[PDB]
Design an enzyme around this catalytic site. Structure first.
Site, PDB file in Angstrom:
ATOM      1  N   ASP A 174       0.796  -1.222   0.000  1.00 41.97           N
ATOM      2  CA  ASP A 174       0.000   0.000   0.000  1.00 41.97           C
ATOM      3  C   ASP A 174       0.831   1.276   0.000  1.00 41.97           C
ATOM      4  O   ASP A 174       0.312   2.341  -0.364  1.00 41.97           O
ATOM      5  CB  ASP A 174      -0.900   0.015   1.239  1.00 41.97           C
ATOM      6  CG  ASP A 174      -2.049  -0.948   1.135  1.00 41.97           C
ATOM      7  OD1 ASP A 174      -1.787  -2.152   0.979  1.00 41.97           O
TER       8      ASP A 174
HETATM    9  S1  LIG Z   1      -3.733  -0.545   0.790  1.00 39.57           S
HETATM   10  C1  LIG Z   1      -4.940  -1.841   1.171  1.00 39.57           C
HETATM   11  C2  LIG Z   1      -6.320  -1.092   1.347  1.00 39.57           C
HETATM   12  N1  LIG Z   1      -7.280  -1.880   0.634  1.00 39.57           N
HETATM   13  C3  LIG Z   1      -7.491  -1.540  -0.760  1.00 39.57           C
HETATM   14  O1  LIG Z   1      -6.900  -0.613  -1.233  1.00 39.57           O
HETATM   15  C4  LIG Z   1      -8.529  -2.376  -1.588  1.00 39.57           C
HETATM   16  C5  LIG Z   1      -9.825  -1.711  -2.146  1.00 39.57           C
HETATM   17  N2  LIG Z   1     -10.765  -1.532  -1.029  1.00 39.57           N
HETATM   18  C6  LIG Z   1     -10.967  -2.529   0.035  1.00 39.57           C
HETATM   19  O2  LIG Z   1     -10.435  -3.576   0.040  1.00 39.57           O
HETATM   20  C7  LIG Z   1     -11.925  -2.173   1.144  1.00 39.57           C
HETATM   21  O3  LIG Z   1     -12.195  -0.818   1.018  1.00 39.57           O
HETATM   22  C8  LIG Z   1     -11.274  -2.421   2.587  1.00 39.57           C
HETATM   23  C9  LIG Z   1     -10.421  -1.177   3.026  1.00 39.57           C
HETATM   24  C10 LIG Z   1     -10.355  -3.658   2.610  1.00 39.57           C
HETATM   25  C11 LIG Z   1     -12.419  -2.731   3.605  1.00 39.57           C
HETATM   26  O4  LIG Z   1     -13.392  -1.713   3.515  1.00 39.57           O
HETATM   27  P1  LIG Z   1     -15.031  -2.021   3.727  1.00 39.57           P
HETATM   28  O5  LIG Z   1     -15.459  -3.392   3.251  1.00 39.57           O
HETATM   29  O6  LIG Z   1     -15.450  -1.869   5.169  1.00 39.57           O
HETATM   30  O7  LIG Z   1     -15.776  -0.827   2.844  1.00 39.57           O
HETATM   31  P2  LIG Z   1     -16.229  -0.993   1.247  1.00 39.57           P
HETATM   32  O8  LIG Z   1     -15.115  -0.563   0.303  1.00 39.57           O
HETATM   33  O9  LIG Z   1     -16.689  -2.404   0.997  1.00 39.57           O
HETATM   34  O10 LIG Z   1     -17.539  -0.040   0.999  1.00 39.57           O
HETATM   35  C12 LIG Z   1     -17.450   1.219   1.574  1.00 39.57           C
HETATM   36  C13 LIG Z   1     -18.391   1.242   2.831  1.00 39.57           C
HETATM   37  O11 LIG Z   1     -17.971   2.464   3.640  1.00 39.57           O
HETATM   38  C14 LIG Z   1     -19.159   3.533   3.451  1.00 39.57           C
HETATM   39  N3  LIG Z   1     -18.657   4.904   3.081  1.00 39.57           N
HETATM   40  C15 LIG Z   1     -17.503   5.263   2.523  1.00 39.57           C
HETATM   41  N4  LIG Z   1     -17.474   6.587   2.369  1.00 39.57           N
HETATM   42  C16 LIG Z   1     -18.657   7.079   2.838  1.00 39.57           C
HETATM   43  C17 LIG Z   1     -19.219   8.376   2.949  1.00 39.57           C
HETATM   44  N5  LIG Z   1     -18.515   9.541   2.492  1.00 39.57           N
HETATM   45  N6  LIG Z   1     -20.419   8.492   3.477  1.00 39.57           N
HETATM   46  C18 LIG Z   1     -21.100   7.449   3.892  1.00 39.57           C
HETATM   47  N7  LIG Z   1     -20.612   6.221   3.804  1.00 39.57           N
HETATM   48  C19 LIG Z   1     -19.397   6.019   3.285  1.00 39.57           C
HETATM   49  C20 LIG Z   1     -19.769   3.148   2.437  1.00 39.57           C
HETATM   50  O12 LIG Z   1     -21.202   3.401   2.413  1.00 39.57           O
HETATM   51  C21 LIG Z   1     -19.593   1.470   2.500  1.00 39.57           C
HETATM   52  O13 LIG Z   1     -20.459   1.131   3.597  1.00 39.57           O
HETATM   53  P3  LIG Z   1     -21.824   0.186   3.490  1.00 39.57           P
HETATM   54  O14 LIG Z   1     -22.469   0.130   4.853  1.00 39.57           O
HETATM   55  O15 LIG Z   1     -21.447  -1.165   2.976  1.00 39.57           O
HETATM   56  O16 LIG Z   1     -22.783   0.826   2.527  1.00 39.57           O
END
Ligand SMILES: *SCCNC(=O)CCNC(=O)[C@H](O)C(C)(C)COP(=O)(O)OP(=O)(O)OC[C@H]1O[C@@H](n2cnc3c(N)ncnc32)[C@H](O)[C@@H]1OP(=O)(O)O
Ligand SMILES: *SCCNC(=O)CCNC(=O)[C@H](O)C(C)(C)COP(=O)(O)OP(=O)(O)OC[C@H]1O[C@@H](n2cnc3c(N)ncnc32)[C@H](O)[C@@H]1OP(=O)(O)O
Lengths: 405, 408, 405, 406
Positions: A174
């Site tokens: 990362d």
């Molecule tokens: S350097 C290694 C980091 N990982 C990566 O780069 C890989 C790509 N992304 C991921 O693997 C995932 O993002 C990780 C970090 C591993 C785990 O994250 P989550 O599974 O918990 O989150 P998601 O990506 O699946 O979905 C995003 C959820 O977070 C909510 N959210 C984000 N931003 C906002 C804002 N601005 N407002 C409200 N909510 C927000 C999203 O809604 C989503 O949540 P849900 O409850 O699922 O809708």
């Protein structure tokens, strides 16, 4: 003051690792990076050690988060609020780059896939990062840097022969592999846009970015059919090449010798002990063959020396050497400080704390370190009223409805 | 669809440097690898293609210099420096990993090279930078890793650290040098003026300290590697290898319960020991007792099962589990197969196919490509100099004085 | 797609590829075993050192995409359940001994009494009828009796076998075709029928022109392999290659081959630059064949399969490697086409890689389908799907009429 | 009242030589009207390939190599590079359920008769193509014949004696069954779909991938175990004894395959219960495998004193898989294949009555039919042009006078 990315605007959904460090580099180049972070889902790093004085109260004391988010603006948009999409669209319409590192499919839940962004702004560069691709049997898998270290082949080849592998001790993938390829792809699309007048999509597989910088494990297997094993702190060509104890607590020096001239210089620094004159160490091939004994004999001697004095002597004699530094030594290093790598920034909550610029010294458009990491929604009103053209009443309405905070 | 063909990149690199120019070649730039008559030192390090040890058998050389043409010039010869200057006159970007001060000392400073090419970007990739207290002195992958703080993190307690594979000190600098080059190139397109881009290994690797610097600045703590925080970036043995686990981070609570769900569902003996809130705090996970019985409970179970099983069953129960893949696993990875990542191209110098890693990114309009097989020494000297306006006779004389080397 | 078709598949070592083809296009395919288990489960090659009921790689491949039940047709209640399944099936494929089902009171007329559309396909070594129908056959003995085996050699040499029981596979492929033809007809007429495919006949489809050589010229032929440069196999550095540099009097095919030899500096290449090679009688003469192999194999023995494939095709000559299993998995064309299908197997606890689609459709989608069933894995749900109560199923299980896992 | 499974189906058949013609031959036996398009200037290469009636290879209608793949078909002679010929093909495509060709890539597109064009002429048409190994990819322009595909698909490596040069099948096997059966199944799948959707679709085959799909062990065993699975001669991995054994006469062998202790007891019985076979070194399947070399030598020493047809009969009557290794004459003269009606003799104006065979399917209600020998080039031009395609007599005469057709 001239800035390489003057006038560039970034709509930044990215969080945690890789994404944020990439947009931090853009901001140091003069880009206006507008981070979208909701109070509903704060960046996990805001709750991760280290904290100022070890006090992890609130969300603005973590150095884990802060170091990746200098020089950014922050609007607190709850993207799941029905009224939020309209705000994001206004921002996308003003943005050169739209970037996210959510799991696959998240942007589409908000109807902010490429199809819609291209219609909002045909000049926007739409950047997505997935663990290992948008499609495929493993495209819904998740992981952190340490997971990609393992999946990409790095960890198996980072350890002592015959022992459990260790990896880097960090979420390495990362920190450099992913953000650098991301940034290069962004810049490639910006260069192309100068000619075509069009943005385009930039999609990265983090797994494939990592393998691209660790080619030996797959290439050696594909060509020769055997697995290339780890080699500890040794080297396949250099000899001697290793990590050797010096005086003090957990003190080691790295020494790496690549030809007979450097071996002669190392022998002279050692005082030309008779053992090192042996025909078993006279050529690179023999020093490799006798590496175990060579390492034992070198360590017996380095353990009687101060590592900083020894390093200075070896470097002055043309022999690659370096003390194995801890983070305090890197922070206090004369070299990194004279280079201006470290930067201290004031913060209304934690005071003056340590940041660093990206590892690029531009002779004409130097990187700038201006502001500490923002609080959630620090610039909500400023961005809404200034860049996005909302009236005062519309902002108050947005805040009353909790679209933004 | 378009590409980088309009950009000419001179790439004077060796063991350190070459991935940066490969990134440009991968998007279609005209990249010319510049060697000395003695040959790029990367040609002389392994791993190797079979039992061959010759100048075209280094797998790294083949990988990092695919997509480039190759010339050979001796800058210690005044007529070599004249040709180099003519080359720079027509280049958008010069990437080089020379020892600091060498080009300046030959009368080839940036001001000279850009005198008739104001847009030229020169990117220097060095162990310690073009300037500063360490700039006069030699460095290698191991010693840059030591001095940056990165190497020290590859161990715990009093254990000596291990190295990362594939010279990550060099790769980190090269990746950031590719970024810096592209930023400066973009700036030059718009301003009309190039500049120098100075990327040091020691700095690029300090970018990879994770949070070790902030641990000292904020808490007066010296950290080493992850690996001993129970269930958080830990490695665990299984039937046919190792897996990597992130079942809990920070004070972020969703992640643990799914891991307990997995252990219970599988009937892991002593799973109940894990169904306890003692596991949610960073100080307990790192305690002697917290870590030891985490491994007792988990590794009694993982040791009976394969890497692929745990990857599958772990992600099936939503636990961030990945295998510690070896080279065989990488080539068998069904996701990489689905994505067409592995690139196979017949090599006429070797008389065999060579398989390479593929594209790290995808573009809506641009096309990534592996490009031509890495050059033989001086393979393109003749045509490249002809492209700069040198007559066939001038090239012959340059070869005759030893200013350049063309292959035969 | 084919989901509307239900296919009952009562096959063992012989039979199963036919139903797999239906499964591959989405049909509801039910593999029907006896409580004793499909005999193919007990044939290798194997997954590692496992020899258990789920470890046969053949069983996994031919019965991927099917669910699985176990019924004992020697039991009246087993026969009753089988008839109810047939009442709702579009197709029954089976490889029982001729006369066996009829003798159990399960003739086609019985099985289709209340299902006039039913197609029944019988796959047997020799057919449902005729003087050989009472007698056992295997892959080798069917290959012998069909005329196919005899062609796998020259002169007085004993012949060799084709791999993967081609007697069975040829019958199965033609039985899938016959099944689909009868199914298409039934869709239009409302009436099914019996489809009788014998291994001995299917393999006689593969005699090339041997039967016409006898009928037209009174000649007995054996295998290709001794006509110089025309379907000949040649040793090379790491295996063998297959070559077709000429057929009949087609000199335009030969000239590019001569140019390949000249361009490579092959010793004596001028021997091949002669119109005598255009004459079939000379190519098959002892001296012609011997001299061809002498000149060509001096060159091929020094080069790899991969080299000769590349260079021969570069010169527009029909050359291919004699690929082994490693060559196949490494084939860059199959990689480009995404042919290899890898699917995690929960019973084995490992990934399994299979051959992929044998054809592409503009609208239909080929798929591997579910992992091959464990014995009686789906007995319960399929019987409930036919209207059996859980209480009735219990009695069927306890009396031994069916086996549910 | 004859019922034919593919009554009314019309096939526009550009295909020639190997796989394609074999597939459409089966369609013709099911009642499909298969109209083969052949140019007199570029006839099917097999028409000039032995075997020929009485070994006389004059002209283009004497080859059994060609004939056997083309029973029951009609034949129009079009020069498709003439502009007026294209219009004839369009009319035929307009009435055809299936359009098939096995030219190299791009050929149909040269004539503006690609799928884009065919779908507009007839949205009900099923458009069938094939290639050696796919139309795109690093090897997509490579060339090969059946024997090349046998080698490339992994079959030939596993068809030989251990430690000897591999042999393969002795034939261009890939083209004879693997490719035509998958082609036919894909056609039939598309026809079944069209019954509900009312639309045709494309059917495309990689010959290599069709072949690998019927030879899975070599790639699967290597992918799973890292082992290259070698050839095994005429042996078997489980059966024992299992092999080819000499009997009395010229190049006479019998295949015998024993899969359990009951079949072994039966073979011992037919051999007269010789003491050597009572040894416990042969009492179990695993011991018979371990001692296969000795066992094969002892079996052959005995079989070489026997008549193979008599021995085969006795073994089959004892429940032991057995079969004489038959040459083509023995297959033609076989009581069983003849009682099954597999072989069919058809009259031909040039070569007289000669041997064909039906496809290997006995339909109980819509049996395959063998009605007419292989046609001559352009035998049915006038009949098809005037009968099916609605051309007037003068337009027919004009089309053929100009050499556009016949
Ligand atoms: S350097 C290694 C980091 N990982 C990566 O780069 C890989 C790509 N992304 C991921 O693997 C995932 O993002 C990780 C970090 C591993 C785990 O994250 P989550 O599974 O918990 O989150 P998601 O990506 O699946 O979905 C995003 C959820 O977070 C909510 N959210 C984000 N931003 C906002 C804002 N601005 N407002 C409200 N909510 C927000 C999203 O809604 C989503 O949540 P849900 O409850 O699922 O809708
Ligand atoms: S079952 C395994 C067999 N292998 C494969 O099927 C894979 C492909 N490999 C091959 O070896 C070729 O398919 C072979 C068998 C060698 C056929 O070679 P051709 O070169 O003859 O066939 P092409 O498709 O490549 O080209 C067709 C040429 O024939 C002329 N033609 C055909 N039909 C007509 C009609 N009706 N009228 C006029 N001309 C016709 C085409 O014009 C063409 O000739 P060109 O010289 O290419 O223009």
């Amino acid at each position: 003051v001239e800035r390489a990315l003057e006038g560039i605007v970034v709509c930044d959904f990215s969080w945690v690792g890789a994404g944020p460090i990439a947009t931090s580099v853009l901001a140091q180049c003069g880009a206006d990076v507008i981070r979208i972070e909701s109070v509903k889902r704060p960046d996990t790093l805001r709750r991760g050690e280290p904290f100022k004085d070890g006090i992890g109260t609130g969300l603005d004391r973590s150095g884990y988060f802060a170091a990746r988010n200098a020089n950014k603006r922050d609007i607190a948009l709850d993207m799941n609020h029905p009224s939020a999409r309209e705000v994001a669209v206004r921002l996308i319409a003003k943005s050169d780059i739209v970037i996210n590192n959510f799991r696959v499919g998240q942007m589409e839940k908000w109807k902010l896939g490429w199809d819609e962004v291209q219609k909002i702004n045909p000049r926007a560069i739409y950047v997505t990062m997935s663990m290992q691709g948008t499609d495929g049997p493993h495209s819904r898998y998740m992981g952190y840097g340490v997971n990609l270290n393992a999946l990409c082949g790095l960890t198996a080849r980072a350890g002592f022969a015959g022992a459990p592998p260790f990896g880097t001790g960090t979420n390495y993938t990362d920190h450099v592999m992913v953000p650098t390829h991301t940034l290069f792809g962004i810049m490639a699309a910006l260069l192309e846009r100068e000619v075509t007048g069009r943005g385009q999509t930039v999609s990265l597989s983090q797994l494939e970015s990592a393998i691209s910088m660790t080619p030996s494990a797959p290439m050696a297997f594909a060509a020769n059919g055997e697995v290339l094993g780890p080699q500890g702190y040794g080297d396949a060509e250099a000899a001697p090449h290793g990590v050797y104890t010096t005086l003090g607590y957990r003190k080691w020096i790295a020494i790496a010798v690549f030809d007979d001239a450097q071996w002669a210089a190392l022998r002279r620094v050692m005082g030309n002990p008779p053992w090192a004159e042996d025909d078993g160490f006279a050529s690179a091939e023999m020093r490799r063959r006798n590496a175990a004994e060579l390492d034992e004999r070198i360590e017996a001697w380095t353990a009687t020396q101060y590592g900083d004095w020894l390093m200075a002597e070896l470097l002055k004699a043309g022999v690659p050497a370096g003390e194995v530094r801890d983070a305090r030594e890197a922070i206090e290093d004369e070299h990194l400080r004279r280079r201006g790598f470290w930067a201290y920034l004031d913060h209304p909550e934690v005071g003056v704390t340590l940041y660093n610029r990206a590892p690029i010294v531009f002779s004409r458009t130097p990187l700038e370190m201006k502001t500490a990491a923002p609080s959630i929604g620090q610039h909500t009103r400023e961005v809404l009223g200034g860049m996005l053209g909302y009236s005062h009443d519309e902002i108050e309405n947005l805040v009353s409805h909790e679209v933004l905070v | 669809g378009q590409d980088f063909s309009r950009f000419r990149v001179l790439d004077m690199t060796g063991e350190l440097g070459p991935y940066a120019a490969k990134m440009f070649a991968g998007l279609g730039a005209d990249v010319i690898h510049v060697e000395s008559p003695a040959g790029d030192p990367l040609r002389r390090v392994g791993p190797w293609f079979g039992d061959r040890r010759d100048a075209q058998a280094s797998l790294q050389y083949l990988y990092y210099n695919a997509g480039k043409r190759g010339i050979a010039v001796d800058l210690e010869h005044e007529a070599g420096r004249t040709a180099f200057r003519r080359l720079c006159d027509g280049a958008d970007l010069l990437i080089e990993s020379c020892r600091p001060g060498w080009l300046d000392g030959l009368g080839l400073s940036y001001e000279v090279l850009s005198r008739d090419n104001a847009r030229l970007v020169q990117t220097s990739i060095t162990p310690f930078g073009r300037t500063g207290p360490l700039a006069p002195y030699p460095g290698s992958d191991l010693t840059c890793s030591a001095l940056s703080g990165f190497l020290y993190l590859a161990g715990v307690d009093g254990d000596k650290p291990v190295r990362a594979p594939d010279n990550q000190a060099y790769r980190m600098a090269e990746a950031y040098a590719a970024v810096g080059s592209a930023i400066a190139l973009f700036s030059a397109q718009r301003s009309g003026r190039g500049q120098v881009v100075d990327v040091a290994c020691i700095e690029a690797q300090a970018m990879a300290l994770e949070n070790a610097a902030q641990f000292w600045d904020l808490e007066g703590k010296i950290r080493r590697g992850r690996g001993r925080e129970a269930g958080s970036a830990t490695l665990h043995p299984c039937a046919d290898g190792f897996i990597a686990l992130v079942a809990i981070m920070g004070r972020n609570k969703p992640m643990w319960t799914p891991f307990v769900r997995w252990m219970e569902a599988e009937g892991v003996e002593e799973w109940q020991v894990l169904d306890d809130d003692k596991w949610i705090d960073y100080a307990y996970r790192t305690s002697e007792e917290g870590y030891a019985t985490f491994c007792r409970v988990f590794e009694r179970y993982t040791r009976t099962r394969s890497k692929a099983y745990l990857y599958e069953i772990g992600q099936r129960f939503n636990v961030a589990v990945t295998p510690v893949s070896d080279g065989r696993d990488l080539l068998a990875n069904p996701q990489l197969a689905h994505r067409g990542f592995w690139q196979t191209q017949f090599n006429d110098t070797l008389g065999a196919n060579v398989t390479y890693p593929g594209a790290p990114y995808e573009f809506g309009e641009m096309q990534w490509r592996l490009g031509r097989n890495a050059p033989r020494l001086g393979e393109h000297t003749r045509e490249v100099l002809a492209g700069c306006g040198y007559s066939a006779s001038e090239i012959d004389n340059l070869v005759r004085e030893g200013a350049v080397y063309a292959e035969q």
